[PDB]
Design a protein around this nucleic acid. Structure first.
Lengths: 117, 55, 150, 51
RNA sequence: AGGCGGCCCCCUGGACGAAGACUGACGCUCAGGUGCGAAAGCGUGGGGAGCAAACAGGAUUAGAUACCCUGGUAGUCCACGCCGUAAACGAUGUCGACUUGGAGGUUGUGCCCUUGAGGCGUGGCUUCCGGAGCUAACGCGUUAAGUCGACCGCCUGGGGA
Protein backbone atom coordinates (compact mmCIF):
# COMPACT_ATOMS: atom_id res chain seq x y z
CA UNK A 1 0.00 0.00 0.00
CA UNK A 2 2.67 2.55 1.10
CA UNK A 3 6.19 2.94 -0.24
CA UNK A 4 9.25 2.18 1.94
CA UNK A 5 12.27 2.94 -0.34
CA UNK A 6 14.39 0.57 1.89
CA UNK A 7 14.66 -3.26 1.84
CA UNK A 8 16.87 -6.35 2.14
CA UNK A 9 17.36 -8.87 -0.69
CA UNK A 10 18.07 -12.60 -0.36
CA UNK A 11 19.79 -14.19 -3.33
CA UNK A 12 20.82 -17.82 -3.73
CA UNK A 13 23.05 -18.69 -6.63
CA UNK A 14 24.36 -22.23 -7.12
CA UNK A 15 25.80 -24.03 -10.14
CA UNK A 16 22.32 -25.63 -10.64
CA UNK A 17 19.81 -23.03 -9.34
CA UNK A 18 19.09 -19.27 -8.90
CA UNK A 19 16.55 -17.83 -6.47
CA UNK A 20 15.79 -14.12 -5.79
CA UNK A 21 13.56 -12.84 -3.00
CA UNK A 22 13.14 -9.28 -1.66
CA UNK A 23 12.24 -8.65 2.02
CA UNK A 24 11.77 -5.69 4.37
CA UNK A 25 13.97 -4.81 7.45
CA UNK A 26 12.00 -7.42 9.56
CA UNK A 27 12.10 -10.31 7.03
CA UNK A 28 8.70 -9.94 5.36
CA UNK A 29 8.94 -10.98 1.68
CA UNK A 30 7.61 -8.32 -0.73
CA UNK A 31 8.45 -10.15 -3.99
CA UNK A 32 9.86 -13.51 -5.06
CA UNK A 33 11.10 -15.05 -8.30
CA UNK A 34 12.86 -18.22 -9.39
CA UNK A 35 14.80 -19.03 -12.54
CA UNK A 36 12.58 -22.18 -12.89
CA UNK A 37 9.52 -19.93 -13.02
CA UNK A 38 11.34 -17.64 -15.50
CA UNK A 39 11.69 -20.69 -17.82
CA UNK A 40 15.21 -22.04 -17.16
CA UNK A 41 15.99 -25.65 -16.06
CA UNK A 42 18.89 -27.92 -15.08
CA UNK A 43 22.42 -26.46 -15.01
CA UNK A 44 21.24 -23.50 -17.21
CA UNK A 45 19.18 -22.42 -14.18
CA UNK A 46 22.56 -20.96 -12.89
CA UNK A 47 23.21 -18.70 -15.97
CA UNK A 48 23.65 -14.85 -16.01
CA UNK A 49 20.52 -14.38 -18.20
CA UNK A 50 18.40 -16.95 -16.27
CA UNK A 51 19.30 -14.94 -13.13
CA UNK A 52 18.59 -11.57 -14.88
CA UNK A 53 15.06 -12.61 -16.00
CA UNK A 54 14.27 -13.66 -12.40
CA UNK A 55 15.93 -10.57 -10.77
CA UNK A 56 14.03 -8.22 -13.15
CA UNK A 57 10.74 -10.01 -12.37
CA UNK A 58 11.53 -9.90 -8.60
CA UNK A 59 12.22 -6.13 -8.90
CA UNK A 60 8.92 -5.84 -10.83
CA UNK A 61 7.28 -7.87 -7.99
CA UNK A 62 8.31 -4.95 -5.61
CA UNK A 63 7.33 -2.16 -8.11
CA UNK A 64 4.45 -1.12 -5.86
CA UNK A 65 6.97 -0.42 -2.97
CA UNK A 66 9.20 2.18 -4.80
CA UNK A 67 12.52 0.66 -3.66
CA UNK A 68 15.74 2.81 -3.80
CA UNK A 69 18.08 1.59 -0.97
CA UNK A 70 19.08 -2.07 -0.52
CA UNK A 71 21.23 -4.46 1.55
CA UNK A 72 21.99 -7.94 0.18
CA UNK A 73 22.38 -11.44 1.69
CA UNK A 74 24.01 -13.86 -0.75
CA UNK A 75 24.02 -17.70 -0.66
CA UNK A 76 25.69 -20.32 -2.78
CA UNK A 77 28.98 -20.61 -4.70
CA UNK A 78 27.59 -19.76 -8.23
CA UNK A 79 29.24 -16.92 -10.27
CA UNK A 80 25.88 -15.24 -11.10
CA UNK A 81 26.11 -12.92 -8.00
CA UNK A 82 27.73 -9.84 -9.65
CA UNK A 83 25.49 -9.99 -12.80
CA UNK A 84 22.40 -10.57 -10.64
CA UNK A 85 23.32 -7.60 -8.40
CA UNK A 86 23.82 -5.50 -11.60
CA UNK A 87 20.51 -6.77 -13.10
CA UNK A 88 18.85 -5.66 -9.84
CA UNK A 89 20.76 -2.29 -9.63
CA UNK A 90 19.30 -1.75 -13.18
CA UNK A 91 15.95 -1.30 -11.37
CA UNK A 92 17.36 1.99 -9.83
CA UNK A 93 18.26 0.34 -6.45
CA UNK A 94 21.57 1.17 -4.70
CA UNK A 95 23.22 -1.68 -2.79
CA UNK A 96 25.04 -0.23 0.32
CA UNK A 97 26.02 -3.56 1.97
CA UNK A 98 26.63 -7.09 0.63
CA UNK A 99 27.08 -10.08 3.00
CA UNK A 100 27.58 -13.80 2.27
CA UNK A 101 25.54 -16.26 4.42
CA UNK A 102 26.09 -19.52 2.46
CA UNK A 103 25.56 -22.85 4.40
CA UNK A 104 29.04 -24.02 3.45
CA UNK A 105 29.09 -26.78 5.89
CA UNK A 106 29.13 -25.59 9.54
CA UNK A 107 26.46 -27.37 9.67
CA UNK A 108 24.39 -29.65 11.97
CA UNK A 109 22.84 -33.05 11.07
CA UNK A 110 24.99 -35.91 9.79
CA UNK A 111 28.32 -35.19 8.05
CA UNK A 112 28.41 -36.56 4.45
CA UNK A 113 31.20 -38.97 3.54
CA UNK A 114 30.86 -39.16 -0.31
CA UNK A 115 33.37 -37.34 -2.51
CA UNK A 116 32.93 -34.02 -4.47
CA UNK A 117 33.17 -33.02 -8.19
CA UNK B 1 51.63 -14.75 26.07
CA UNK B 2 50.47 -12.30 28.77
CA UNK B 3 46.75 -13.16 28.86
CA UNK B 4 45.91 -14.84 25.47
CA UNK B 5 42.40 -13.38 25.06
CA UNK B 6 43.73 -10.18 23.38
CA UNK B 7 41.28 -9.79 20.48
CA UNK B 8 43.42 -7.07 18.77
CA UNK B 9 46.18 -9.67 18.43
CA UNK B 10 43.76 -12.49 17.42
CA UNK B 11 42.23 -10.22 14.68
CA UNK B 12 45.71 -9.92 13.15
CA UNK B 13 45.78 -13.73 12.50
CA UNK B 14 42.43 -13.99 10.61
CA UNK B 15 41.08 -12.86 7.16
CA UNK B 16 38.39 -10.24 6.52
CA UNK B 17 35.96 -13.25 6.54
CA UNK B 18 37.36 -14.34 10.00
CA UNK B 19 39.23 -17.43 8.72
CA UNK B 20 42.51 -18.59 10.33
CA UNK B 21 45.44 -17.51 8.14
CA UNK B 22 47.75 -20.29 6.98
CA UNK B 23 51.15 -20.63 8.72
CA UNK B 24 53.07 -19.75 5.49
CA UNK B 25 51.63 -16.21 5.19
CA UNK B 26 52.75 -15.34 8.80
CA UNK B 27 55.97 -17.37 8.78
CA UNK B 28 54.66 -19.22 11.89
CA UNK B 29 56.08 -22.56 13.15
CA UNK B 30 53.54 -25.41 13.52
CA UNK B 31 54.27 -25.57 17.34
CA UNK B 32 52.75 -22.07 17.59
CA UNK B 33 50.13 -22.33 14.74
CA UNK B 34 48.28 -25.16 16.65
CA UNK B 35 48.28 -23.09 19.88
CA UNK B 36 47.17 -19.95 18.01
CA UNK B 37 44.36 -22.04 16.40
CA UNK B 38 43.43 -23.24 19.95
CA UNK B 39 43.46 -19.59 21.12
CA UNK B 40 41.22 -18.45 18.18
CA UNK B 41 38.83 -21.43 18.76
CA UNK B 42 38.75 -20.69 22.55
CA UNK B 43 38.01 -17.01 21.79
CA UNK B 44 34.64 -18.14 20.26
CA UNK B 45 33.86 -19.79 23.65
CA UNK B 46 34.76 -16.39 25.25
CA UNK B 47 32.34 -14.65 22.79
CA UNK B 48 35.21 -12.38 21.55
CA UNK B 49 34.93 -13.71 17.94
CA UNK B 50 31.97 -15.31 15.97
CA UNK B 51 32.21 -19.01 14.98
CA UNK B 52 31.61 -17.81 11.40
CA UNK B 53 31.43 -14.17 10.22
CA UNK B 54 28.22 -15.38 8.45
CA UNK B 55 26.51 -15.32 11.90
CA UNK C 1 42.89 -27.50 -41.92
CA UNK C 2 44.50 -23.98 -41.56
CA UNK C 3 46.54 -22.94 -44.66
CA UNK C 4 43.44 -22.48 -46.87
CA UNK C 5 41.14 -19.74 -48.18
CA UNK C 6 39.50 -17.32 -47.34
CA UNK C 7 37.92 -16.10 -50.60
CA UNK C 8 39.15 -16.56 -54.18
CA UNK C 9 38.77 -13.56 -56.50
CA UNK C 10 36.06 -13.25 -59.19
CA UNK C 11 35.89 -10.76 -62.07
CA UNK C 12 33.03 -8.24 -62.01
CA UNK C 13 30.17 -8.20 -64.58
CA UNK C 14 31.50 -6.64 -67.88
CA UNK C 15 28.26 -4.70 -68.57
CA UNK C 16 27.37 -3.53 -65.03
CA UNK C 17 30.85 -3.38 -63.38
CA UNK C 18 29.59 -5.28 -60.24
CA UNK C 19 31.05 -8.26 -58.32
CA UNK C 20 27.67 -9.08 -56.78
CA UNK C 21 26.27 -9.61 -60.33
CA UNK C 22 29.27 -11.81 -61.01
CA UNK C 23 28.67 -14.05 -57.91
CA UNK C 24 24.96 -14.10 -58.72
CA UNK C 25 25.42 -15.75 -62.16
CA UNK C 26 27.96 -18.18 -60.66
CA UNK C 27 25.40 -19.55 -58.15
CA UNK C 28 22.43 -19.15 -60.55
CA UNK C 29 23.95 -21.14 -63.44
CA UNK C 30 23.49 -24.93 -63.67
CA UNK C 31 25.75 -27.58 -65.14
CA UNK C 32 28.28 -24.72 -65.80
CA UNK C 33 26.02 -23.27 -68.58
CA UNK C 34 26.74 -19.63 -67.56
CA UNK C 35 25.69 -18.43 -71.09
CA UNK C 36 22.04 -19.22 -70.23
CA UNK C 37 22.37 -17.46 -66.84
CA UNK C 38 23.62 -14.33 -68.75
CA UNK C 39 20.16 -14.39 -70.47
CA UNK C 40 18.29 -14.77 -67.14
CA UNK C 41 20.07 -11.93 -65.24
CA UNK C 42 18.52 -8.54 -66.16
CA UNK C 43 15.80 -10.47 -68.17
CA UNK C 44 14.30 -11.29 -64.74
CA UNK C 45 14.50 -7.51 -63.92
CA UNK C 46 11.82 -6.60 -66.55
CA UNK C 47 9.00 -6.16 -64.01
CA UNK C 48 11.34 -4.42 -61.42
CA UNK C 49 12.67 -1.47 -63.56
CA UNK C 50 9.99 1.13 -62.76
CA UNK C 51 9.03 -0.52 -59.43
CA UNK C 52 12.54 0.07 -57.96
CA UNK C 53 12.59 3.33 -55.93
CA UNK C 54 16.42 3.12 -55.86
CA UNK C 55 16.26 3.18 -59.71
CA UNK C 56 17.06 0.14 -61.91
CA UNK C 57 20.79 0.15 -60.92
CA UNK C 58 19.82 -0.93 -57.33
CA UNK C 59 16.65 -2.98 -58.20
CA UNK C 60 18.45 -6.22 -57.24
CA UNK C 61 20.70 -4.76 -54.44
CA UNK C 62 17.51 -3.80 -52.61
CA UNK C 63 16.66 -7.54 -52.13
CA UNK C 64 20.11 -8.04 -50.53
CA UNK C 65 19.81 -4.92 -48.32
CA UNK C 66 16.61 -6.42 -46.82
CA UNK C 67 18.77 -8.93 -44.80
CA UNK C 68 22.31 -8.13 -43.47
CA UNK C 69 22.76 -10.13 -40.14
CA UNK C 70 25.83 -10.27 -37.81
CA UNK C 71 25.28 -13.81 -36.31
CA UNK C 72 23.62 -17.16 -37.28
CA UNK C 73 22.69 -20.09 -34.91
CA UNK C 74 24.53 -23.37 -35.28
CA UNK C 75 24.18 -26.62 -33.27
CA UNK C 76 27.59 -27.81 -32.11
CA UNK C 77 29.06 -30.69 -30.01
CA UNK C 78 30.91 -29.97 -26.69
CA UNK C 79 31.10 -33.66 -25.60
CA UNK C 80 28.23 -36.13 -24.97
CA UNK C 81 26.04 -33.00 -25.42
CA UNK C 82 25.10 -30.80 -28.46
CA UNK C 83 24.07 -27.15 -27.95
CA UNK C 84 22.99 -24.09 -29.95
CA UNK C 85 25.71 -21.38 -30.36
CA UNK C 86 25.88 -18.02 -32.25
CA UNK C 87 28.51 -17.87 -35.00
CA UNK C 88 29.68 -14.64 -36.65
CA UNK C 89 28.44 -13.57 -40.14
CA UNK C 90 31.40 -11.65 -41.56
CA UNK C 91 31.37 -8.74 -44.14
CA UNK C 92 32.25 -11.24 -46.94
CA UNK C 93 28.99 -13.22 -46.23
CA UNK C 94 26.86 -10.34 -44.90
CA UNK C 95 26.26 -9.13 -48.54
CA UNK C 96 25.92 -12.67 -50.09
CA UNK C 97 23.44 -14.37 -47.68
CA UNK C 98 20.05 -13.38 -49.15
CA UNK C 99 21.44 -13.81 -52.70
CA UNK C 100 21.83 -17.56 -51.89
CA UNK C 101 18.28 -17.88 -50.56
CA UNK C 102 16.62 -16.25 -53.65
CA UNK C 103 18.21 -18.68 -56.13
CA UNK C 104 17.07 -21.70 -54.02
CA UNK C 105 13.53 -20.37 -54.01
CA UNK C 106 13.55 -19.95 -57.85
CA UNK C 107 15.03 -23.45 -58.40
CA UNK C 108 12.35 -24.97 -56.09
CA UNK C 109 9.54 -23.27 -58.11
CA UNK C 110 7.88 -24.86 -61.26
CA UNK C 111 5.77 -22.43 -63.35
CA UNK C 112 6.79 -20.27 -66.42
CA UNK C 113 10.36 -19.72 -67.61
CA UNK C 114 13.31 -19.48 -65.14
CA UNK C 115 13.44 -15.67 -65.80
CA UNK C 116 9.88 -15.60 -64.43
CA UNK C 117 10.45 -18.13 -61.53
CA UNK C 118 13.26 -15.82 -60.36
CA UNK C 119 11.02 -12.76 -60.73
CA UNK C 120 8.35 -14.29 -58.44
CA UNK C 121 10.71 -14.34 -55.40
CA UNK C 122 12.44 -11.01 -56.35
CA UNK C 123 9.08 -9.22 -56.39
CA UNK C 124 8.55 -9.88 -52.62
CA UNK C 125 12.22 -10.18 -51.48
CA UNK C 126 12.18 -6.62 -49.99
CA UNK C 127 8.46 -6.62 -49.13
CA UNK C 128 8.33 -9.94 -47.13
CA UNK C 129 4.49 -9.95 -47.35
CA UNK C 130 3.86 -13.70 -48.00
CA UNK C 131 2.77 -16.29 -45.36
CA UNK C 132 5.46 -18.26 -43.47
CA UNK C 133 8.24 -16.64 -45.59
CA UNK C 134 10.11 -14.94 -42.64
CA UNK C 135 10.80 -18.44 -41.16
CA UNK C 136 13.75 -17.99 -43.56
CA UNK C 137 15.29 -15.54 -41.02
CA UNK C 138 14.69 -17.56 -37.78
CA UNK C 139 18.31 -18.74 -38.05
CA UNK C 140 19.46 -15.12 -37.32
CA UNK C 141 16.60 -13.99 -35.08
CA UNK C 142 17.47 -16.93 -32.79
CA UNK C 143 21.13 -15.74 -32.89
CA UNK C 144 20.62 -12.10 -31.78
CA UNK C 145 18.74 -13.77 -28.85
CA UNK C 146 21.20 -16.54 -27.95
CA UNK C 147 21.72 -17.06 -24.13
CA UNK C 148 23.61 -20.35 -23.99
CA UNK C 149 25.58 -20.35 -20.63
CA UNK C 150 27.39 -16.92 -20.45
CA UNK D 1 44.53 -9.63 1.63
CA UNK D 2 42.54 -10.87 -1.48
CA UNK D 3 38.97 -9.85 -0.83
CA UNK D 4 39.37 -7.35 2.16
CA UNK D 5 36.38 -5.16 1.04
CA UNK D 6 33.39 -5.06 3.31
CA UNK D 7 30.01 -3.48 2.79
CA UNK D 8 29.59 -2.27 -0.94
CA UNK D 9 30.89 -4.59 -3.69
CA UNK D 10 30.80 -5.01 -7.54
CA UNK D 11 32.12 -7.49 -10.18
CA UNK D 12 33.82 -10.85 -9.61
CA UNK D 13 37.06 -10.62 -7.53
CA UNK D 14 37.37 -14.44 -6.94
CA UNK D 15 40.43 -15.24 -9.04
CA UNK D 16 43.72 -14.22 -7.33
CA UNK D 17 47.40 -15.14 -7.04
CA UNK D 18 49.31 -16.40 -3.92
CA UNK D 19 48.03 -18.39 -0.91
CA UNK D 20 45.40 -21.20 -1.25
CA UNK D 21 46.51 -23.75 -3.87
CA UNK D 22 50.16 -23.05 -4.79
CA UNK D 23 52.49 -20.23 -3.53
CA UNK D 24 52.65 -21.72 -0.86
CA UNK D 25 49.88 -23.89 0.74
CA UNK D 26 47.69 -26.70 -0.76
CA UNK D 27 48.14 -28.47 -4.13
CA UNK D 28 51.40 -29.95 -5.45
CA UNK D 29 51.41 -32.45 -2.45
CA UNK D 30 52.76 -35.29 -4.62
CA UNK D 31 56.06 -33.31 -4.64
CA UNK D 32 56.23 -33.77 -0.79
CA UNK D 33 59.86 -33.11 0.31
CA UNK D 34 60.01 -30.28 -2.35
CA UNK D 35 58.24 -28.31 0.42
CA UNK D 36 61.36 -28.53 2.71
CA UNK D 37 64.59 -29.82 1.18
CA UNK D 38 65.21 -27.17 -1.64
CA UNK D 39 65.71 -24.51 1.13
CA UNK D 40 66.90 -21.10 -0.34
CA UNK D 41 65.59 -21.98 -3.88
CA UNK D 42 61.96 -22.30 -2.67
CA UNK D 43 62.03 -20.84 0.92
CA UNK D 44 62.95 -17.14 1.54
CA UNK D 45 62.47 -17.27 5.33
CA UNK D 46 64.85 -17.08 7.50
CA UNK D 47 63.98 -14.73 10.34
CA UNK D 48 64.55 -10.89 10.77
CA UNK D 49 61.40 -10.20 8.65
CA UNK D 50 57.85 -11.67 8.87
CA UNK D 51 59.27 -14.82 10.58
C1' A E 1 46.24 -52.66 18.51
C1' G E 2 41.34 -51.00 17.40
C1' G E 3 41.79 -46.18 17.88
C1' C E 4 40.98 -41.26 20.28
C1' G E 5 39.32 -34.62 18.48
C1' G E 6 34.95 -30.66 19.83
C1' C E 7 34.43 -25.72 25.17
C1' C E 8 35.17 -26.11 31.06
C1' C E 9 36.23 -28.52 35.70
C1' C E 10 37.67 -32.75 39.05
C1' C E 11 39.99 -37.35 39.11
C1' U E 12 43.58 -40.31 36.43
C1' G E 13 47.02 -44.13 33.26
C1' G E 14 51.53 -44.52 30.52
C1' A E 15 56.40 -42.04 28.35
C1' C E 16 61.40 -39.22 28.80
C1' G E 17 66.32 -37.09 30.72
C1' A E 18 71.00 -35.32 33.99
C1' A E 19 74.04 -35.49 38.45
C1' G E 20 73.58 -38.24 42.64
C1' A E 21 70.95 -41.76 46.03
C1' C E 22 69.01 -47.39 47.23
C1' U E 23 68.49 -52.97 46.81
C1' G E 24 72.59 -55.82 45.04
C1' A E 25 71.17 -59.99 39.05
C1' C E 26 65.97 -58.45 42.42
C1' G E 27 66.21 -59.24 35.30
C1' C E 28 64.36 -61.26 29.80
C1' U E 29 60.83 -64.19 27.44
C1' C E 30 56.77 -67.23 28.33
C1' A E 31 52.75 -73.28 26.93
C1' G E 32 48.46 -72.49 29.58
C1' G E 33 46.43 -68.22 32.57
C1' U E 34 44.18 -62.80 33.05
C1' G E 35 43.03 -58.71 30.16
C1' C E 36 41.34 -54.94 25.27
C1' G E 37 36.89 -53.70 18.96
C1' A E 38 37.04 -49.79 13.97
C1' A E 39 32.25 -51.72 12.08
C1' A E 40 28.14 -54.77 11.15
C1' G E 41 24.97 -58.19 14.30
C1' C E 42 22.48 -60.13 18.31
C1' G E 43 20.45 -59.52 23.78
C1' U E 44 17.60 -56.56 28.05
C1' G E 45 15.43 -51.68 27.84
C1' G E 46 15.05 -46.74 25.46
C1' G E 47 15.12 -43.35 21.42
C1' G E 48 13.97 -41.68 15.97
C1' A E 49 15.93 -35.18 13.89
C1' G E 50 19.91 -36.62 10.10
C1' C E 51 20.81 -40.74 6.79
C1' A E 52 19.11 -45.39 5.04
C1' A E 53 19.55 -51.11 3.62
C1' A E 54 14.64 -53.94 2.68
C1' C E 55 9.96 -52.42 0.22
C1' A E 56 6.79 -48.81 -2.56
C1' G E 57 6.17 -44.54 -6.32
C1' G E 58 8.36 -42.37 -11.00
C1' A E 59 11.96 -42.35 -14.60
C1' U E 60 16.11 -43.74 -17.83
C1' U E 61 16.47 -48.73 -20.64
C1' A E 62 16.07 -54.47 -24.28
C1' G E 63 15.20 -55.05 -19.03
C1' A E 64 17.46 -51.34 -14.87
C1' U E 65 16.68 -55.85 -9.90
C1' A E 66 21.85 -49.69 -10.34
C1' C E 67 22.80 -44.25 -10.84
C1' C E 68 18.73 -40.08 -10.73
C1' C E 69 14.32 -38.88 -7.44
C1' U E 70 9.62 -38.58 -3.74
C1' G E 71 9.20 -41.72 0.77
C1' G E 72 10.97 -45.35 4.63
C1' U E 73 11.91 -49.89 8.53
C1' A E 74 16.08 -52.11 10.83
C1' G E 75 20.64 -49.87 12.26
C1' U E 76 23.41 -45.57 13.61
C1' C E 77 22.65 -42.64 19.32
C1' C E 78 22.21 -44.30 24.74
C1' A E 79 22.25 -47.55 30.05
C1' C E 80 24.71 -51.13 28.63
C1' G E 81 25.72 -56.66 27.80
C1' C E 82 27.78 -60.69 24.45
C1' C E 83 31.27 -61.73 20.51
C1' G E 84 36.32 -61.42 19.89
C1' U E 85 35.29 -59.63 13.80
C1' A E 86 38.52 -56.99 9.31
C1' A E 87 42.81 -54.74 4.17
C1' A E 88 42.81 -55.61 13.06
C1' C E 89 47.41 -54.06 6.15
C1' G E 90 52.02 -48.48 7.94
C1' A E 91 52.17 -56.82 6.12
C1' U E 92 57.82 -55.14 10.74
C1' G E 93 56.42 -61.30 17.52
C1' U E 94 59.22 -59.80 22.51
C1' C E 95 64.35 -58.66 24.51
C1' G E 96 69.91 -57.61 23.59
C1' A E 97 74.00 -55.24 20.70
C1' C E 98 77.61 -53.09 16.68
C1' U E 99 77.67 -49.66 12.42
C1' U E 100 77.56 -44.30 7.84
C1' G E 101 76.16 -39.53 5.82
C1' G E 102 72.43 -35.48 4.97
C1' A E 103 67.89 -32.30 4.86
C1' G E 104 63.92 -31.26 8.80
C1' G E 105 60.74 -30.97 13.23
C1' U E 106 59.77 -31.86 18.43
C1' U E 107 60.94 -32.99 23.73
C1' G E 108 64.30 -33.62 27.84
C1' U E 109 69.08 -32.51 29.61
C1' G E 110 73.81 -29.79 29.76
C1' C E 111 76.67 -26.05 27.82
C1' C E 112 77.99 -21.15 24.87
C1' C E 113 84.48 -15.52 24.63
C1' U E 114 75.87 -16.28 22.74
C1' U E 115 77.51 -8.90 19.43
C1' G E 116 72.58 -14.40 16.48
C1' A E 117 66.93 -11.09 14.47
C1' G E 118 70.23 -17.18 18.56
C1' G E 119 74.12 -21.12 18.43
C1' C E 120 76.11 -26.13 19.95
C1' G E 121 76.63 -30.77 22.60
C1' U E 122 73.92 -35.34 24.22
C1' G E 123 69.48 -38.73 25.37
C1' G E 124 63.91 -40.01 23.77
C1' C E 125 60.44 -39.49 19.76
C1' U E 126 60.70 -38.94 14.27
C1' U E 127 59.76 -37.72 8.35
C1' C E 128 62.26 -38.41 3.89
C1' C E 129 66.76 -39.39 0.79
C1' G E 130 71.26 -41.98 0.87
C1' G E 131 76.68 -45.58 1.62
C1' A E 132 77.90 -50.95 3.14
C1' G E 133 75.59 -55.52 3.29
C1' C E 134 71.05 -58.98 2.42
C1' U E 135 67.04 -60.48 -0.98
C1' A E 136 64.95 -63.17 -7.41
C1' A E 137 63.14 -58.10 -7.27
C1' C E 138 60.93 -53.94 -4.85
C1' G E 139 63.89 -52.20 -1.72
C1' C E 140 65.55 -52.58 3.97
C1' G E 141 69.05 -48.87 5.09
C1' U E 142 71.49 -47.27 12.63
C1' U E 143 63.70 -46.54 14.48
C1' A E 144 67.34 -52.32 9.01
C1' A E 145 65.06 -56.97 5.32
C1' G E 146 72.98 -55.56 7.34
C1' U E 147 75.27 -58.25 11.94
C1' C E 148 74.22 -61.68 15.99
C1' G E 149 72.79 -64.03 21.27
C1' A E 150 67.80 -65.47 24.61
C1' C E 151 62.35 -67.07 24.56
C1' C E 152 57.40 -68.43 22.35
C1' G E 153 54.32 -69.50 17.94
C1' C E 154 53.95 -70.34 12.28
C1' C E 155 55.64 -72.54 6.98
C1' U E 156 56.64 -77.13 3.15
C1' G E 157 51.42 -76.61 -4.30
C1' G E 158 46.74 -75.12 -6.02
C1' G E 159 41.14 -77.21 -7.07
C1' G E 160 38.59 -79.66 -2.90
C1' A E 161 39.21 -76.66 2.80
Amino acid sequence: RKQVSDGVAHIHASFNNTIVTITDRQGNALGWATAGGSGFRGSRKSTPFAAQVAAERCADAVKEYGIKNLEVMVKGPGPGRESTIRALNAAGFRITNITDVTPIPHNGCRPPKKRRV
Amino acid sequence: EIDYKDIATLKNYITESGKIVPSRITGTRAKYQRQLARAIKRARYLSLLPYTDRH
Amino acid sequence: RRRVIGQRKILPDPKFGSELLAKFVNILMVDGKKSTAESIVYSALETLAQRSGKSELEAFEVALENVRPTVEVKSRRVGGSTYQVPVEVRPVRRNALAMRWIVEAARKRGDKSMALRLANELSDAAENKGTAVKKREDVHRMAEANKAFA
Amino acid sequence: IKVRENEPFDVALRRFKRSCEKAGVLAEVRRREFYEKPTTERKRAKASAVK
